[PDB]
């Protein structure tokens, strides 16, 4: 449950794949759609 | 609650250590006790 | 999840990786 | 028409394949690197462009290209199968330019966000794209009707922070989707209503009304405690003003909020029993309200509800109510599908002022054997092909006219289609604030408003009649500096089968014109002698009109290679035979037979005279003679005769017009060029009269200071 | 513009009708920091005697003015401009960029339109289950 998706409108992990636009301040860029795990998580017990 | 509880809806979203609700404000308090990040709540409360 | 380099709040915790840097940027 | 058929038939012979061996749809993208050297399901094309001086960019005829915006993903299920239906279009897009080969665009959006544009071109060239089919100005127009919307924000203490901001775009970006046929009022409501800006009924959709009503929207406040009950009572009556006017249907109002607990019953079924009002409500940020009762409302009355959580949303949440919109007009069947043409706007592919006529597409699947309706109400999108407004121009020439005569057409908003003072820039909305998207609609009145009679001219042109109005009225002078009081005669006819009014300007003195004769290949040979580039020595330095004569000579800015281009085809070929323009060839040197005759007769007598400095002649048929050879550098007028302000103003004036030079400028003063004063020649064939030609003289300025 | 030089017996020209003014808004216009403000002026009296007295910072100037009867001009003598201090407002012709018409007063006389007459906005076949609360 710690898996996490670059753009946070993409739930799923196939959805998550493309281009997608950041809109900070005074600019628009875009970047990947990475589907990613959090830095620490909880998938075994010695990750825990 | 009483001193911060309406005022941290700032331009940039409400931080998710809020003194908003009472299960918002226990745990705030619990972090502070605890000192992680004690000095960036208090910078969102000389903010607020 | 704000992406790198985008304007940070540390006390926001919603950076992507790592957390809000101390030039306030991720 | 035929396009919308095959793509009809095309959609409902598909099959909803869900698995694809990453080869198997071909298509350009037209987005990609020429020269990667290097997916999912899909094997891009490399094309050959080559030229085409008809759209200035580089272009190839062998395929059709494809845009899918940047957010959409290019290897997704639904894209890839719209991929597949919309590769059949391309045998229509080549035949529909093998029937007319003038055709510019042919572009389909889609409701998923791709479009497909027949003549494959790269994309346009701070290079995010952040182009949408979906929300450009002629797809809004073909996938719905005229709406009566009003914005119904709401301010409280809630909405205060983040979601305020998000409120605020998200209130400009819809407004954004609006149209001139379209009327807009945004409201606001923390306990009681009241209008956001100095509206108080509706407005008009323009690009003024717009403006504020984004400048007002952005002047917002968070305070209060919510009252639901007074905003839908207060918009509801906003809904049921008559006095003024409105597009009449399509009545929807959109809330624009975070979350609540009143749902109120009693004001949707006191105002809104019949279900004729349609509601949208948005819950706007990210928060943790009751979202329950603003779906109760959406659904209850007709209509859906979005959701905004962060700024990247805000675009596809707000550009969706069209398709919730176009149902009734699917259901009507072969009824809704009219040809409807657009304002004048800037092509996105740097093609000038287009105008584009839309229509839309069903989904008919399972329409022949009545079983599938589940999804068969909304559109698959809007077809579209784009004609410029120099085909229009083209249909109506204007070189048997004088200077002062013109056409132009209005459509029922009053908009100018044609007119000699629109130009192609985008419409100024107020002072520059300091520190092409938009429709380029230029109201008539806005050449020179008389109240007497070029309003009733425009109402009854919009009104679609035909007639014919003489009046006295005042022209300004092209240079934007003199107002001549001249005699101007109005004609006008509507355009039958469609929208556009069509009239023609005429003065009194340009009711006839001079016709060339064919005269003889003897009369071109001397004629012709008298404009080469080495021959305007004794006869002055001599102009001519870039007026396109032959299909081969092309129109060039500097005079000279116009000049020298001209002499070599009027010496390589006869000007009538090589499918060129006889009667503009003809009287062009007819013109410079008139004036070398002139000049050589009479200007040759005296070489110099004590108070000019330069004797000029331009006569209708694009000539231009300065006797003077030191003085033809000086010449900064137009070499086009029909764009000359001082030839305009002197037709309309029947005695000695005096052009002022300008001041502070780094062109030559009115110390070594001299003071411009012209003469308007007149003659008279038959009793009819003729104004043909223009003369003058520049006068010394410091033999006039001695003089003085 | 003989407006900047002598701005006095300009405005006075206008008052006592010898230049007629009225003005037009360019919306196609580009500006330095847009909508502008035009002016031009020309003759409104067709007559030549247009005698008349300043009366200009309690130093009166006075004037004749007359018209070359062939040609478009006017001769126009002052008695002075620098011996007799005035006002100055200068009295501009040239392009302003400004604010076009109050849309709030536009909008209370809207002109004339014929909006389309088709319009498809109901139908009793239409399903209404897409409420979009129930599909997410
Ligand atoms: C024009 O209208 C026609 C019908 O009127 C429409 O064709 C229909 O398209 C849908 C897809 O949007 C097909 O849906 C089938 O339904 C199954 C079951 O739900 C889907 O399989 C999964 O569905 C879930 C959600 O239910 C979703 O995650 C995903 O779609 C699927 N998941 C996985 C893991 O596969 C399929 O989408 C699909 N089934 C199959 C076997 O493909 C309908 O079957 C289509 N109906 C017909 C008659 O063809 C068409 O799309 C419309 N035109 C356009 C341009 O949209
Ligand atoms: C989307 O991709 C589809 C999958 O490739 C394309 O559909 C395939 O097109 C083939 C033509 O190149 C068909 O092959 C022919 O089909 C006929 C059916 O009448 C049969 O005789 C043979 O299978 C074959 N005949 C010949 C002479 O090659 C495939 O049947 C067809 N379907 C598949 C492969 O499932 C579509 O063309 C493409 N979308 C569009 C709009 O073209
Ligand atoms: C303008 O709209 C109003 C209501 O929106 C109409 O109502 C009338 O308002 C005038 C104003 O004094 C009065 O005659 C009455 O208050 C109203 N008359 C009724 C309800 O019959 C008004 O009629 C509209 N304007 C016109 C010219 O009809
Ligand atoms: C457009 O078509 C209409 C027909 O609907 C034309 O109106 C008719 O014109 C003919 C002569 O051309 C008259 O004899 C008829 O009496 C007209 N019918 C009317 C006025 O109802 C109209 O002239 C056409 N316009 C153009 C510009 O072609
Ligand atoms: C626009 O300019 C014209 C040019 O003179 C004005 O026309 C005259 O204006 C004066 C007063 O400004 C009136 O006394 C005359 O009767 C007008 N002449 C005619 C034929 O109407 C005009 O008034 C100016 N203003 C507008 C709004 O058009
Ligand atoms: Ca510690
Ligand atoms: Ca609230």
Excluded at chain 4, 450 to 474: H, W, Y
Aim: charged share 25%.
């Amino acid at each position: 449950k710690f898996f996490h998706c670059t753009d946070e409108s993409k739930e799923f992990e196939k959805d998550c794949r493309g281009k997608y636009l950041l809109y900070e301040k005074n600019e628009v860029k875009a970047r990947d759609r990475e589907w990613k795990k959090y830095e620490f998580h909880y998938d075994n017990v010695l990750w825990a | 609650m009483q001193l911060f509880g309406g005022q941290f809806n700032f331009d940039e979203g409400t931080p998710p250590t809020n003194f908003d609700t009472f299960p918002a404000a226990i745990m705030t308090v619990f972090q502070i006790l605890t000192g992680e990040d004690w000095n960036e709540v208090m910078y969102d409360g000389i903010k607020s | 999840c704000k992406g790198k380099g985008a304007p940070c709040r540390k006390t926001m915790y919603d950076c992507c990786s790592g957390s809000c840097g101390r030039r306030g940027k991720c | 028409v035929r396009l919308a058929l095959e793509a009809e038939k095309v959609q409902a012979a598909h099959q909803w394949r869900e698995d694809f061996a990453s080869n198997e749809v071909v298509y350009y993208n037209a987005k990609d690197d020429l020269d990667p050297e290097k997916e999912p399901g899909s094997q891009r094309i490399k094309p050959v462009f080559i030229e085409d001086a008809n759209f200035g960019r580089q272009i190839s005829y062998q395929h059709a290209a494809v845009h899918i915006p940047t957010d959409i993903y290019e290897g997704s299920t639904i894209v890839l199968n719209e991929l597949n239906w919309t590769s059949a279009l391309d045998e229509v897009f080549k035949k529909n330019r093998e029937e007319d080969p003038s055709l510019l665009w042919q572009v389909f959006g889609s409701a998923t966000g791709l479009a497909r544009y027949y003549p494959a071109s790269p994309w346009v060239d701070n290079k995010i794209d952040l182009y949408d089919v979906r929300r450009r100005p002629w797809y809004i127009q073909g996938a719905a009707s005229p709406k009566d919307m009003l914005i119904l924000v709401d301010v409280s203490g809630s909405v205060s922070g983040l979601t305020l901001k998000l409120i605020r775009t998200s209130v400009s970006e819809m407004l954004e989707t609006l149209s001139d046929d379209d009327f807009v009022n945004v409201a606001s409501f923390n306990s009681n209503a009241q209008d956001v800006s100095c509206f108080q009924h509706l407005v008009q959709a323009n690009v003024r009304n717009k403006k504020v009503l984004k400048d007002a929207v952005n002047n917002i406040t968070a305070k209060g405690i919510t009252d639901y009950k007074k905003g839908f009572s207060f918009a509801f009556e906003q809904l049921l003003n008559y006095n003024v006017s409105r597009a009449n249907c399509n009545k929807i109002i959109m809330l624009f909020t975070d979350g609540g607990e009143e749902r109120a019953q009693e004001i949707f079924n006191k105002y809104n029993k019949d279900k004729k009002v349609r509601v949208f409500t948005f819950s706007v940020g990210q928060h943790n309200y009751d979202r329950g009762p603003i779906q109760w409302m959406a659904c209850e009355n007709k209509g859906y509800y979005y959701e905004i959580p962060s700024i990247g949303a805000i675009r596809i949440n707000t550009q969706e109510y069209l398709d919730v919109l176009g149902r009734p007009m699917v259901l009507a069947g072969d009824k809704a599908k009219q040809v409807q043409w657009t304002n004048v706007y800037l092509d996105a592919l740097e093609l000038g002022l287009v105008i584009t006529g839309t229509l839309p597409v069903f989904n008919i699947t399972g329409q022949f054997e009545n079983k599938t309706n589940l999804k068969n109400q909304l559109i698959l999108g809007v077809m579209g092909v784009d004609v410029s407004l120099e085909d229009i121009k083209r249909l109506t020439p204007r070189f048997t006219l004088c200077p002062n005569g013109y056409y132009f057409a209005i459509d029922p908003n009053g908009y100018v289609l044609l007119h000699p003072n629109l130009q192609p820039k985008p419409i100024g909305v107020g002072i520059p604030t300091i520190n092409s998207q938009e429709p380029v609609t230029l109201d008539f009145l806005d050449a020179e408003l008389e109240n007497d009679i070029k309003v009733e001219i425009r109402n009854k042109m919009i009104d679609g009649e035909s007639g014919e109005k003489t009046f006295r009225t005042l022209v300004k002078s092209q240079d934007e500096r003199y107002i001549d009081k001249g005699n101007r005669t109005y004609t006008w006819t509507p355009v039958n089968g469609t929208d556009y009014s069509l009239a023609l300007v005429l003065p009194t003195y340009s009711f006839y014109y001079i016709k060339a004769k064919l005269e003889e290949t003897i009369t071109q040979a001397r004629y012709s002698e008298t404009l080469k580039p080495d021959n305007f020595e004794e006869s002055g330095y001599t102009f001519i009109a870039p007026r396109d004569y032959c299909n081969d000579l092309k129109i060039s800015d500097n005079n000279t290679e116009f000049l020298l281009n001209f002499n070599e085809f009027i010496d390589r070929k006869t000007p009538n035979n090589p499918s060129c323009n006889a009667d503009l060839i003809n009287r062009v040197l007819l013109d410079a037979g008139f004036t070398n005759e002139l000049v050589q007769n009479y200007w040759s007598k005296q070489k110099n005279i004590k108070g000019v400095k330069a004797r000029f002649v331009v006569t209708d048929g694009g000539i231009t003679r300065v006797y003077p050879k030191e003085a033809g550098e000086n010449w900064q007028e137009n070499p086009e005769t029909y764009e000359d302000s001082f030839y305009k103003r002197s037709l309309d004036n029947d005695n000695y017009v005096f052009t002022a030079p300008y001041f502070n400028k780094s062109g030559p003063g009115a110390y070594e060029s001299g003071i411009m004063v012209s003469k308007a020649v007149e003659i008279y064939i038959q009793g009819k009269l003729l104004k043909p030609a223009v003369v003058g003289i520049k006068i010394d300025v410091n033999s006039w200071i001695e003089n003085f | 513009f003989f407006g900047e030089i002598d701005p006095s017996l300009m405005r006075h020209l206008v008052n006592i009708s010898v230049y007629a003014f009225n003005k037009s808004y360019d919306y196609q216009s580009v500006c330095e920091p847009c909508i502008t403000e035009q002016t031009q002026y020309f003759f409104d009296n067709d007559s030549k005697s247009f005698s008349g007295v300043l009366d200009c910072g309690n130093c009166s100037r006075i004037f004749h003015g007359e018209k070359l009867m062939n040609t478009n001009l006017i001769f126009i003598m002052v008695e002075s401009k620098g011996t007799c201090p005035c006002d100055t407002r200068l009295l501009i012709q040239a392009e302003q960029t400004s604010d076009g018409p109050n849309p709030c007063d536009m909008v209370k006389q809207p002109r004339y339109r014929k909006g389309p007459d088709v319009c498809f906005d109901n139908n009793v076949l239409e399903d209404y289950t897409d409420c979009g609360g129930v599909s997410g």
